[PDB]
């Protein structure tokens, strides 16, 4: 099943989207430079791209510590960074009250991993009717995403993106299973599988390898995050590696 | 470190406290027929009870199975319950707004494991200064639990309980890591550790072993959600027998 | 289904048997110290006892270390152990022609967790007749050992020790799943189960090894293997454990 | 560090090694034709081919299922292989006895996952002065086979190869780390390092596992076929030659 976003068609069998940004929303200058650069490289490479940001950093490790931005000036940089530049964008949400708001603005809401059981937040996130992107939680199995996709189907929304991010191994350990893709592709309808390279990590050599691995798959998508995290400059060069196998696959008969 | 819960005291060196009931709040008359049977098989045994309901379930089977009654009538239900019975009561906040009037009239307030680093409610919760049970998320390591108390310590509520529910292991699993007890109470300063049995075997005989072998290493209290006197009475033995021995020299 | 080794009966509803002894033989004077200390102590405790070592370390850090005494020398310490102290004995086997020679002296010969598939390993080990220790490897489901339980009863061999190590957490990592201790029983016709804390792991590590030793005993087992008193405090503290889950009905 | 194995070139910068055959060898003439025909495949795609059997399977079903033709017969076998169709064939040992006759014949000699940490066995294989496989034990870290590899070399062999097959994830059930080749390379100072898909699948999933790996820029891919179908060999070598075309034609970065 492919999903329209914009002009933007996403899907497993069409060229891969890069959902691509920041870890947090810092200021409005900050995030223009950010986003400048990836519609700059992007464009000229030819890859659908998508701007992503979080305005609020909810679990982090001090409750003193920079949370961002905040949801009302979260938005304001939003609403520029559209007008701006033209391309769509995606943020989480972490409340349910927070969902028509956000949704308003940003094409795509993201519902984090470890809110995925948080079944309140599942339903006002389908009533907006909005592009949904599922965190696939490091404890749930790739044969599972179904039990969510099947919430969001219940509620009335079937504009789902399904986003790889690593299972847990051990203790403090992640591991990306490459069969996962497949058996979400399987089991969930064929609905668009994107990869989160980043938070799979959890290294510019070993993100381009992965990266490189997972897309090797016939994926829709990447999802990842430079800092001025892939260092800013490295993006182009990067994505030039990533489209080159991207094209590749895709060219090949499933 | 010891909780003092009411008349209870709560702590790895003391008599092991029962936290149990069901998982959703319906009637008064349900509650109170429910917990009717944990209160008559516990002052029977004289293990000390805590009950457990949820008012306002968020991480549900399906969308449209029951929330439950609600703030107004849960907190009626539970008011009547600590009245009827002279127990404590246990329940989950998912909503930081909700800590404040849920403290009002229940002892224990619970973190559900996957909110467990949601910052506002953590705050929240902290802010009611009564005692709190912090569910340790699947996903994180016996180690990574001090973070979180630390952040309750913050927030100026050192009230906290730690409760164990197993770890992912490899797909759909979860195992107990029995050497992750020892490793709670080293690092976060000897708080109440205590074993959530029932959601360890999440997504019976095996229980017992289970719930045994945790207890055999030293803790205050086991957690389930409902034979229960047989099972009880096989808990107590090996408890009264662990607690009446002195630490390793 | 117990198990007699000579004047010792295992079994899972039994007073647990504690198999203890060193990791590898290197001369018999240090062997006879070791095994005196916990005979001395079992004695005195009331725990039957087995003594344990290797006669040789497979892997070694080196290809330049020292390996043990080896075969020849590690089967005639062993027998002066067993005319000194009268007790059984245990070692692990590593190649099939081993077996039998191991087998003449040894009274339990245990398959390594890692030789556990070889399946010419097993039919030698199995050809004895003597008790075998079949340690599970760490990869494997509970309900699995039942596999490797009919291949020596194929062989003809029913005289069968589970022996839990630990199962495969990440990376460099073990954890002991409690459950499966029952699922091996149920599975495997209630052959004894005992429970190797030493190798299952990896006041400080006497601490953690204490915690580990109860909880798997907590599930009522034949045994408890092992590799300023603390010996005698910790089985102090096992054999309570022990006597209170062996008096309650099943 | 590159490997020559007769005229094949193997290294992680190289074109990709194919190394395919049977599980258990059960016969000669059987043998033979299934090495025929990956013969035929990959000299029609110019893809380098070490055909792989074992003689004597340790790790069987059942105490009685054949363990194959043995050592005798088996090196027979390999030297008809050899000897017919010109290429370099691959097997695994269980015991130093075996290695010198093993060695004699086989261009690359193996040593199993389940022995890789048997000493006697490292020195043995090691003082064959043969080109060695090490497959990678389930149950051991990327960063732990460097401690083989000094062993290895220790004992004076440097020719050796590292070869993934997945790590234990939970109960009975295999994952492959994508990783974990970075580490062994980076660790193990840039031997060959191959995959072997077959024993990592606990199929279009061994053709997603095979294609992701290979994505990582290897040395080459190890598979078995009765285990992929033998009639799909062609059409899966085409998308795996595709893709290793395609990065190994950029330089690292
Ligand atoms: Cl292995
Ligand atoms: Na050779």
Do not use: W
Request: aromatic residues 8%; neutral net charge; contains cysteine.
């Amino acid at each position: 099943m492919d999903i329209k976003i914009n002009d933007i068609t996403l899907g497993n069998n069409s060229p891969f989207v890069l959902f691509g940004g920041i870890n947090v929303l810092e200021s409005l200058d900050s995030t223009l430079q950010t986003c400048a650069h990836y519609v700059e490289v992007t464009r000229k490479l030819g890859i659908p791209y998508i701007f992503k940001a979080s305005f609020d950093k909810a679990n982090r490790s001090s409750i003193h510590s920079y949370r961002g931005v905040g949801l009302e000036e979260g938005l304001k940089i939003f609403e520029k960074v559209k007008a701006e530049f033209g391309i769509p964008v995606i943020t989480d949400v972490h409340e349910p009250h927070q969902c028509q708001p956000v949704a308003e603005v940003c094409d795509v809401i993201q519902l984090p991993a470890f809110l995925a059981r948080q079944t309140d937040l599942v339903v006002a996130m389908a009533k907006t009717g909005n592009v949904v992107n599922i965190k696939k939680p490091q404890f749930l199995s790739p044969s599972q995403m179904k039990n969510i996709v099947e919430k969001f189907h219940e509620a009335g929304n079937g504009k789902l993106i399904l986003c790889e991010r690593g299972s847990s191994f051990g203790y403090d350990n992640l591991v990306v299973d490459m069969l996962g893709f497949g058996v979400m592709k399987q089991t969930c309808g064929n609905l668009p599988v994107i990869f989160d390279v980043t938070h799979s990590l959890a290294r510019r050599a070993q993100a381009l390898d992965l990266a490189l691995a997972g897309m090797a798959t016939r994926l829709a998508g990447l999802f990842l995050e430079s800092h001025p995290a892939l260092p800013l400059h490295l993006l182009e060069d990067f994505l030039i590696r990533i489209k080159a196998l991207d094209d590749l696959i895709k060219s090949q008969p499933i």
